[PDB]
Chains A and B, each alone.
Chain A
Amino acid sequence: VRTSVLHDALNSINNAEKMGKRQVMIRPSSKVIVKFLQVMQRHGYIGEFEEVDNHRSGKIVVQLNGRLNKCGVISPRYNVRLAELEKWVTKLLPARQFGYVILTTSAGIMDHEEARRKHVAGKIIGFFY
Chain B
Amino acid sequence: GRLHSKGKGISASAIPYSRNPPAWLKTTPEQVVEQICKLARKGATPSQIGVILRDSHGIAQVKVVTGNKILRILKSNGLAPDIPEDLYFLIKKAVAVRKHLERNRKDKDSKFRLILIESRIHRLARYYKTVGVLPPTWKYESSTASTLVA
A54 interface residue per 8 A CB criterion = yes
* Residues 3-33 of B at the A interface (beta carbon under 8 Å): 15, 17
Secondary structure of the B contact surface, majority rule = loop
Chain A nearest CB, measured from B116 CB (Å): 21
**Which B residues are within 8 Å of any A CB, using their own CB?**
15, 17
3 contacts between A and B (CB under 8 A): A54-B17, A55-B15, A55-B17
Number of interface residues of A (CB under 8 A): 2
Closest to A54 in B: B17
Find chain A residues with CB under 8 A from B15 CB: 55
Minimum CB–CB distance for B75 against chain A, Å: 25
What 3 A-B pairs have minimum CB-CB distances, sorted nearest first?
A55-B17, A54-B17, A55-B15
A54 / chain B contacts, CB cutoff of 8 Å = 17
In the complex, A54 Cα to B15 Cα: how many Å?
11
The A41-68 residues at the B interface (CB cut-off 8 A) are 54-55
Chain A residues with Cβ under 8 A from B17's Cβ?
A: 54-55
Interface string of A15-59 (1 = CB under 8 A from B): 000000000000000000000000000000000000000110000
